[PDB]
């Protein structure tokens, strides 16, 4: 049957909001809400070879703050800090010159246990005609060896160019989805294939967080050893 | 219904045409799309071609039609007989 979005079910209990701002009026509540979607979508669609896992936006009456975590920031940084200025001009045009931008590219710890880059890597393999079984098995084994809990990958679509759509799942461990105290990270990606669209869904379990707080601390962002 | 202070309503394009048309003796049908304009005393004696949706049906105003709407004296849909489904 249908399941509630795993990320959306855990909001306001253990996970904070990716955008934290208070607008003036219902007209400024819409502009400040559509603009950040453009900014986030910009970051994710293009500038992808960097493995950006999550981008949070912080705005006040007039000051916009962006916190961008990535696995390979060299592509954002560019040659002797070139691409960074370039990307800055895009962001300024989107929100407006009248404001102040404060990009804060932060390197990420524990890159594996983030559902965004894993889903992006899974999706990338499918456009390159890589066999699905091998691609999925190889990504899971590196992820499992990296030291996390169970991962569930669902890749529904016109699998392998077929004319009848299927779906393949691969669970490996205890993934208690009905439980609220678990630290489950969820992300979704669209693999654009020559034969259509492939939907890849990745559930990752990153332990148990008895914390009653909403984020308030780096999750997989933390850099352990 | 319509308030008093506001009064009546014509598009004022019809008024210029109507004033011009009353001065000119050889009056001809007025092709108007404005069904919202109310029939004003000066309209009396003229003939109009109101847009029913497809064509312009001709209505000859009299000393009596004054007050109603110019589109009220023309139809929009037509129904005259059903057909046994069975």
């Amino acid at each position: 049957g249908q399941k509630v979005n795993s990320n959306g079910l855990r909001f306001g209990i253990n996970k904070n909001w990716i955008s934290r701002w208070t607008a003036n009026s219902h007209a400024q509540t819409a502009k400040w809400l559509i603009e950040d979607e453009k900014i986030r979508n910009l970051f994710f669609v293009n500038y992808r070879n960097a493995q950006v896992s999550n981008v949070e936006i912080e705005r006040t009456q007039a000051t916009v703050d962006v916190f961008v975590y990535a696995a390979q920031p060299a592509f954002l940084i560019g040659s002797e800090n070139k691409n960074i200025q370039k990307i800055t001009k895009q962001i300024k045009q989107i929100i407006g010159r009248t404001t102040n931008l404060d990009l804060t590219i932060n390197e990420i710890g524990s890159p594996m246990l983030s559902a965004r880059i894993i889903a992006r890597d899974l999706a990338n393999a499918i456009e390159a005609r890589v066999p699905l079984r091998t691609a999925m098995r190889q990504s899971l084994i590196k992820v499992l060896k990296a030291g996390a809990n169970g991962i569930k990958v669902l890749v529904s679509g016109r699998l392998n160019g077929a004319e009848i759509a299927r779906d393949k799942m691969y669970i490996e461990g205890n993934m208690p989805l009905s439980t609220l105290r678990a630290d489950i990270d969820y992300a979704l990606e669209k693999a654009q294939t020559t034969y259509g669209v492939i939907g890849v869904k990745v559930w990752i379990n990153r332990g148990m967080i008895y914390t009653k707080g909403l984020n308030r601390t780096p999750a997989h962002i933390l850099h352990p050893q | 219904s319509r308030s008093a202070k506001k009064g009546a309503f014509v598009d004022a394009h019809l008024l210029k045409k109507v004033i011009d048309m009353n001065k000119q003796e050889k009056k001809r049908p007025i092709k108007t799309w404005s069904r919202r304009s109310t029939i004003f005393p000066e309209f009396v004696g003229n003939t109009f071609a109101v847009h029913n949706g497809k064509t312009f049906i001709n209505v000859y105003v009299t000393d009596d039609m004054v007050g109603h709407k110019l589109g009220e004296f023309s139809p929009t849909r037509n129904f005259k007989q059903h057909t046994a489904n069975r």
């Binding site: 990320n7 959306g8 909001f11 909001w17 990716i18 208070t22 819409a30 809400l33 559509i34 | -």
Partner: protein
């Protein structure tokens, strides 16, 4: 015929009553939340990702 309707809605009309509110991400006309300028089915994606601050699930 969606983008042109979206563009026409952005453009100011010649009468005030000619102005309607469309969703700002997509182009859906009906079921638009004036509180957010976002239609009902865009609100799910924003609420389920944390883009909208303070939007948590409700239990009553």
């Amino acid at each position: 015929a969606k983008k042109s309707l979206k563009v026409k809605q952005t453009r100011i009309p010649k009468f005030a009553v000619r102005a309607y509110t469309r969703c700002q991400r997509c182009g859906r006309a009906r079921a638009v939340l004036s509180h957010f300028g976002v239609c009902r089915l865009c609100f799910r994606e924003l609420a389920y990702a944390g883009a909208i601050p303070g939007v948590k699930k409700a239990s009553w």
